[PDB]
Amino acid sequence: NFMLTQPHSVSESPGKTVTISCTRSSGSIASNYVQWYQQRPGSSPTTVIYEDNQRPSGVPDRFSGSIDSSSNSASLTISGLKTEDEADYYCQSYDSSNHVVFGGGTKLTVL
Structure with missing residues (x-):
């Protein structure tokens, strides 16, 4: 059985x-694949x-999916954060x- 270690909880300014x-x-x-x-x-x-x-047209592309050739972990960038991005994340x-x-x-909270 494998596990998924990711940031516990954090908040960022809109x-x-x-x-x-x-x-x-x-x-x-x-x-x-992630x-x-x-x-x-x-x-x-x-x-x-x-x-x-x-990337679905419905949901804003404001999400970025990417990976490193390192094979250590998977890294996304989400640009344009707002009360809209406020919510929990799961992968x-x-x-x-x-x-x-x-x-x-x-648990992502948008101050």
């Missing part, structure tokens, strides 16, 4: 840039990026051998 990092206890990221999810009370989970590339990963996992539970 208008700043936020970057989320998701690491697998396996050290495999630039090797496997996904970003958002969830908050009064709503339902909405995949904002898939294949750590896929899922999967290799070639299926086995889908979910984690990266972080």
